[PDB]
Design a protein around this ligand. Structure first.
Ligand code: HEM
Length: 137
């Protein structure tokens, strides 16, 4: 289920983080606009760009901690507040985070593996709700 999925993801996190974030950027091409540097790049090119490897590892390292601290897929209010307060996310809205989770859930569905995709879909909606309650636009 969801807790085991965190352990699965963590066991190969560099790879999963890049694959899921590329699924997000390929499903939602207009999302690259938050990432200028990313335009006109194939996936292998993005993987070779230092700020891509670094944003993506930090995203998944922190997303796994937020998932780990969750109860039944409902994140802590304090984790939502911490995400809203990040100054590098100034321009972001709940729609940016919704889209990431739609791509993550589709990725898990399409995988050969027994991920609990339902639980991740709920985690994504619950995190969006929490972010809105903490002050995200
Ligand atoms: C749970 C989800 C996410 C987490 C935990 C997260 C975490 C972080 C962290 C810790 C940083 C600062 C460290 C760094 O730049 O290397 C950062 C920067 C940034 N994040 Fe996120 N982020 C998330 C989702 C998003 C999404 C969905 C977008 C846009 C669609 C986004 C856009 C950015 C931008 C533009 C920066 C600064 C410049 C850059 O990415 O190179 N993040 N993020």
């Amino acid at each position: 289920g969801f807790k085991q999925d965190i352990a699965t993801l963590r066991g190969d996190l560099r790879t999963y983080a890049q694959d899921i974030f590329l699924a997000f950027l390929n499903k939602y091409p207009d999302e690259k606009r938050n990432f200028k540097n990313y335009v006109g790049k194939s996936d292998q090119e993005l993987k070779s760009m230092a700020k891509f490897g670094d944003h993506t590892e930090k995203v998944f390292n922190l997303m796994m901690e937020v998932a780990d601290r969750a109860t039944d897929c409902v994140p802590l209010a304090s984790d939502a507040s911490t995400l809203v307060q990040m100054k590098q996310h100034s321009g972001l809205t709940t729609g940016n985070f919704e889209k990431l989770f739609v791509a993550l859930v589709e990725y898990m569905r399409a995988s050969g593996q027994s991920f609990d995709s339902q639980s991740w879909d709920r985690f994504g909606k619950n995190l969006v709700s929490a972010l809105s309650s903490a002050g995200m636009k």
